[PDB]
Design an enzyme around this catalytic site. Structure first.
Site, mmCIF file in Angstrom:
data_model
loop_
_atom_site.group_PDB
_atom_site.id
_atom_site.type_symbol
_atom_site.label_atom_id
_atom_site.label_comp_id
_atom_site.label_asym_id
_atom_site.label_seq_id
_atom_site.Cartn_x
_atom_site.Cartn_y
_atom_site.Cartn_z
ATOM 1 N N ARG A 127 0.830 -1.173 0.000
ATOM 2 C CA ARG A 127 0.000 0.000 0.000
ATOM 3 C C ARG A 127 0.887 1.253 0.000
ATOM 4 N NH1 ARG A 127 -2.090 -4.793 -0.094
ATOM 5 N NH2 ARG A 127 -4.346 -4.877 0.129
ATOM 6 N N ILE A 179 -9.459 15.667 37.017
ATOM 7 C CA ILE A 179 -10.656 14.877 37.295
ATOM 8 C C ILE A 179 -10.231 13.427 37.410
ATOM 9 C CG2 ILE A 179 -12.870 14.144 36.521
ATOM 10 C CD1 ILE A 179 -13.249 16.935 35.221
ATOM 11 N N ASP A 309 -4.411 1.878 14.537
ATOM 12 C CA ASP A 309 -5.707 2.491 14.782
ATOM 13 C C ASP A 309 -6.669 1.505 15.440
ATOM 14 O OD1 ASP A 309 -4.656 4.675 13.355
ATOM 15 O OD2 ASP A 309 -5.822 4.257 11.551
HETATM 16 C C1 LIG Z 1 -2.501 14.351 9.294
HETATM 17 N N1 LIG Z 1 -2.513 13.126 8.522
HETATM 18 C C2 LIG Z 1 -1.308 12.727 7.717
HETATM 19 C C3 LIG Z 1 -3.495 12.189 8.708
HETATM 20 N N2 LIG Z 1 -4.435 12.462 9.665
HETATM 21 C C4 LIG Z 1 -5.346 11.526 10.024
HETATM 22 N N3 LIG Z 1 -5.496 10.322 9.453
HETATM 23 C C5 LIG Z 1 -4.628 10.035 8.437
HETATM 24 C C6 LIG Z 1 -3.577 10.897 8.012
HETATM 25 N N4 LIG Z 1 -2.924 10.298 6.960
HETATM 26 C C7 LIG Z 1 -3.500 9.063 6.762
HETATM 27 N N5 LIG Z 1 -4.605 8.954 7.629
HETATM 28 C C8 LIG Z 1 -5.523 7.800 7.752
HETATM 29 O O1 LIG Z 1 -4.692 6.748 8.231
HETATM 30 C C9 LIG Z 1 -5.519 5.528 8.128
HETATM 31 C C10 LIG Z 1 -4.697 4.279 8.224
HETATM 32 O O2 LIG Z 1 -4.013 4.235 9.505
HETATM 33 C C11 LIG Z 1 -6.252 5.718 6.818
HETATM 34 O O3 LIG Z 1 -7.633 5.442 7.049
HETATM 35 C C12 LIG Z 1 -6.116 7.228 6.462
HETATM 36 O O4 LIG Z 1 -7.215 7.989 6.086
#
Ligand SMILES: CN(C)c1ncnc2c1ncn2[C@@H]1O[C@H](CO)[C@@H](O)[C@H]1O
Ligand SMILES: CN(C)c1ncnc2c1ncn2[C@@H]1O[C@H](CO)[C@@H](O)[C@H]1O
Ligand SMILES: [Cl-]
Ligand code: NA
Ligand code: NA
Length: 351
Positions: A127, A179, A309
């Site tokens: 990916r 808290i 995540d």
């Molecule tokens: C600030 N950035 C770079 C980001 N902020 C929040 N989510 C992010 C991201 N760059 C990629 N993603 C999300 O990471 C997930 C996989 O861990 C993807 O769902 C993608 O949208």
């Protein structure tokens, strides 16, 4: 309709997932397997992606994690989320995907801006991620967020939210701070967040109850905040003793040497290796946790994006159920291992 158990802020992003030829990476100057922010020259990557019939799925790191929490809690409005979207078609697609899962959301609309998008490009079994934050950067926590979040004692932000403004995460942590049973939790998100927001993150950590991160994030944290001596900064966290020292040094960024009844916990995910955590217990003594990661064969791992995540979502779900630190880590492992064994960053239907 609740009860709301977890509240998070994030960058709400639509993921566009597609199989592409190698010429597509090359045409857009992408390095295979990297995750970056779209460059000017990559402006037309999302429209160009349409010829490869991409799938649209909800994304964004924090949104992924609370969607895991909501899936496990099942009742509508069990997890709440805020972030900013654009006044565009993509923002409606993302909102509806979240509504259908029962998540409680308030998406702030930024007129004229485009909803966050991430191209998830599949090519030779890797990916390549290319994200354009757009409207996400406009998010400013509304004055009534505590009313929206009523009932939740677990709060979460990714360090990725600092890229809009650190004030959002500082306000959420500021509400929980002091808290005893309000728990603010934070993800280090990426090495660059650690350097770019060094002083805001140092302040935020003082208000943090649980810090999550992977090995490279913590390596950067140790270097930027001098948590270990120079001679140790390049040591491998695949080394238990080194991982433990790093976690224990990071814990001091949360506790400032103080001891209260509040939770103070640092959790380092280590890939295939055991999760390591350092906990300041009730009486101030520090306890170290080591939780084995069940073996998953190389051949069964589709992709490790989204593993962290999902780990955090499983951990926070278990935390909402009053489980022990080790049980919360085991739940995070279970969720992460589900997600890495299929396409997509969501738990399987049958999980
Ligand atoms: C600030 N950035 C770079 C980001 N902020 C929040 N989510 C992010 C991201 N760059 C990629 N993603 C999300 O990471 C997930 C996989 O861990 C993807 O769902 C993608 O949208
Ligand atoms: C063989 N590899 C790379 C792995 N094998 C088994 N579990 C894995 C994993 N890489 C990551 N995970 C899981 O995802 C979490 C966050 O990276 C790890 O804590 C572990 O549960
Ligand atoms: Cl996020
Ligand atoms: Na304590
Ligand atoms: Na997956």
């Amino acid at each position: 309709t609740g009860p709301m158990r977890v509240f998070a802020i994030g960058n709400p992003i639509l993921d566009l997932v597609a199989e592409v030829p190698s010429s597509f990476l090359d045409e857009f100057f992408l390095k295979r397997g990297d995750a970056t922010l779209a460059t000017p020259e990559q402006m037309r990557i999302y429209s160009t992606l349409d010829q490869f019939n991409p799938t649209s799925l909800p994304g964004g790191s924090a949104l992924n994690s609370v969607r895991v929490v909501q899936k496990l809690l099942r009742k509508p409005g069990s997890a709440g989320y805020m972030g900013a979207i654009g006044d565009d078609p993509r923002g409606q697609v993302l909102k509806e995907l979240c509504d259908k899962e029962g998540l409680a959301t308030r998406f702030m609309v930024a007129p004229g801006q485009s909803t966050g998008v991430c191209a998830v490009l599949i090519n030779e079994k890797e990916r390549t991620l290319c994200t354009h934050l757009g409207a996400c950067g406009s998010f400013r926590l509304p004055e009534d967020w505590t009313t929206f979040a009523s009932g939740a004692l677990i709060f979460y932000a990714t360090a990725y939210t600092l890229t809009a403004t650190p004030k959002n995460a500082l306000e959420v942590a500021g509400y929980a701070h002091g808290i005893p049973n309000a728990i603010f939790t934070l993800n280090l998100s990426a090495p660059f967040c650690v350097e770019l927001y060094k002083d805001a993150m140092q302040s935020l950590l003082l208000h943090t109850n649980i810090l999550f991160g992977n090995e490279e994030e913590f390596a950067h944290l140790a270097k930027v905040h001098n948590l270990v001596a120079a001679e140790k900064t390049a040591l491998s966290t695949a080394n238990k003793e080194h991982a433990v020292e790093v976690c224990t040094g990071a814990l001091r960024l949360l506790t400032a040497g103080q001891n209260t009844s509040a939770t103070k916990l640092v959790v380092m995910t280590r890939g295939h290796n055991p999760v390591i955590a350092a906990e300041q217990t009730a009486d101030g003594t520090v306890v170290v946790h080591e939780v084995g990661v069940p073996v998953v064969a190389a051949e069964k791992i589709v992709d490790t994006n989204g593993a962290g995540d999902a780990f955090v979502g499983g951990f926070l779900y278990a935390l909402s159920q009053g489980k022990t630190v080790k049980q919360c880590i085991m739940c995070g492992n279970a969720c992460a291992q589900d997600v890495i064994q299929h396409v997509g960053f969501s738990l399987s239907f049958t999980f």
